[PDB]
Amino acid sequence: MEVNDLGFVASILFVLVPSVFLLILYIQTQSREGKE
């Protein structure tokens, strides 16, 4: 079965690197909420 040879690189960085951007920004808020 034919494939574009590079979409699995492309659609694993398309899903991760904005979501771990988003997953970075939720933890910081939790620390701030704690007041630590």
């Binding site: 034919e2 574009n4 920004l25 701030r32």
Partner: protein, 504 residues
């Protein structure tokens, strides 16, 4: 704090690090242009500039440095073909090499203003808050850009201290670098004349000079300073991206239709070469110049270069190619090997007949064969129950004139079906769909991908212009409205709407 979409508003107050937050952005774009063009030099194939030229290899950035006078690339290969080479510092790498170190020297200066702010320059003397004058600074930004266009007009494009831009002939054959003369008349206003682009930045630069020489000396009026809110830093941010997406519409336009600043040898044909058949008006002209001149078809169709035959192909027209058929044009066809001539179709009677078909916004044109006035004489029968115009009953022959496979006729109607579809795509071409893994369906050139990526982005910069244009006029109301205001909104506020200084 603040939400994630208003992160950069920390820099909106103090302009100490606002220089620094452009300067890593400026290091990121300069550290793209070297970082992409060095990759773009890693896949070139300079062995055949006539058969697979440099826009065939899907190459976005090496027309744009190439179309100002650079050629040599420390490999013995030059696009021009001009010899006696010895590049030195300005080759392809050397521009692309320089943008790495410049972006490194941009990034080291980008980290300097982040740690050092309040350098006695960003505040007024009236109080110590950080605030910078914008209209006095516009007179000193534009006077530098007025000097630099006047440098770019006369001192680079006209041979005084620099090589000229790219200029070709029409039907682009002998396109090389020579300094163009700035033509001042009305003839420089059509964009196919390159003499206007030299006369551009002299004349626009001299009024760019006389703008900024004027703009330093005067002050804006207070009926504009409170109106356009010129003390605010975001009022430069709206109405400069208005002047960017206005500026991005024209190179969405003038790349797509074509100009002298977008020639054929480094961008491809420009999609309107099939809607009139522009290149097919020439190779048909030269054989009828050679035809009646004193030369037969077969022997003629040979002083045509293969470069003219390569521009009369559907597979170099930039219409075809899709959004997600990704890669160079050589992933669509492979490497162009040879012309193998021009097909001429004859019946059992003569009655010469031709194929001039496949316009651009189709994908699968059904093959028709017609005569001079337009009555169909042959086609490919989709249902062979009631055929009356098929190939086999008519007995069409192929005369393949000129090229690689000159003089080889085909009378078997199983093989005429292959060259009929090849005649749909202008002139056929030999390929090799195994060296690069080319599949067989079309791609688009760098002229196609530019205008997609400069008109979709110019749509997006229109929305930021509405958004930043709202927030400048509506700065005070932006965190919500004052509470009631029921007397301003109810009807009977003498007479003009929204007036407190009235009967109300």
């Amino acid at each position: 704090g603040l939400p994630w979409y208003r992160v950069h508003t920390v820099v909106l107050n103090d302009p100490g690090r606002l220089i620094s937050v452009h300067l890593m952005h400026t290091a990121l774009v300069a550290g793209w242009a070297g970082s992409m063009a060095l990759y773009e030099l890693a896949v070139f194939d300079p062995s055949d500039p006539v058969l697979n030229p440099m826009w065939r290899q899907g190459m976005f950035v090496m027309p744009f440095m190439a179309r100002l006078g650079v050629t040599q690339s420390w490999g013995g290969w030059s696009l021009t073909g001009e010899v006696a080479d010895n590049p030195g510092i300005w080759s392809f790498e050397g521009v692309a090499a320089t943008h790495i170190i410049l972006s490194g020297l941009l990034f080291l200066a980008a980290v300097w203003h982040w740690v050092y702010w309040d350098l006695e320059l960003f505040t007024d003397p009236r109080t110590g808050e950080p605030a910078l004058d914008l209209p006095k600074m516009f007179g000193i930004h534009l006077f530098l850009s007025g000097l630099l266009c006047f440098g770019f007009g006369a001192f680079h494009l006209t041979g005084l201290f620099g090589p000229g831009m790219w200029v070709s002939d029409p039907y682009g054959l002998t396109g090389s670098i020579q300094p163009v003369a700035p033509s001042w008349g009305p003839e420089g206003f059509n964009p196919f004349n390159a003499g206007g682009i030299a006369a551009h930045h002299i004349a626009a630069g001299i009024v760019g000079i006389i703008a900024g020489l004027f703009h330093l000396s005067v002050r804006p009026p207070q009926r504009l300073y409170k109106a356009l809110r010129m003390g605010n830093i975001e009022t430069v941010l709206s109405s400069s991206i208005a002047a960017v997406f206005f500026a991005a519409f024209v190179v969405a336009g003038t790349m797509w239709y074509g100009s002298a600043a977008t020639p054929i040898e480094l961008f491809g044909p420009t999609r309107y070469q099939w809607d009139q058949g522009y290149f097919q008006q020439e190779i048909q002209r030269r054989v009828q110049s050679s035809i009646a001149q004193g030369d037969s078809p077969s022997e003629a169709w040979s002083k045509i270069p293969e470069k003219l035959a390569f521009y009369d192909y559907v597979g170099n027209s930039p219409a075809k190619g899709g959004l997600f058929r990704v890669g160079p044009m050589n992933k669509g066809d492979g490497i162009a090997q040879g012309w193998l001539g021009h097909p001429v179709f004859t019946d059992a009677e003569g009655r010469e007949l031709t194929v001039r078909r496949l316009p651009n916004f189709f994908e699968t044109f059904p093959v028709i064969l017609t005569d001079a006035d337009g009555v169909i004489r042959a086609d490919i029968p989709f249902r062979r129950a009631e055929s009356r115009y098929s190939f086999e009953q008519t007995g069409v022959t192929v005369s393949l004139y000129g090229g690689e496979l000159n003089g080889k006729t085909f009378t078997d109607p199983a093989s005429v079906k292959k060259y009929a579809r090849f005649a749909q795509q202008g002139e056929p071409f030999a390929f090799d769909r195994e060296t690069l893994g080319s599949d067989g369906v079309f791609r688009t050139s760098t002229r196609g991908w530019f205008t997609f990526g400069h008109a979709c982005f110019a749509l997006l910069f229109f929305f930021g212009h509405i958004w930043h244009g709202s927030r400048t006029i509506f700065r005070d109301v932006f965190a919500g409205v004052e509470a009631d205001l029921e007397e301003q909104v109810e009807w009977g506020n003498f007479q003009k709407v929204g007036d407190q200084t009235t009967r109300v």
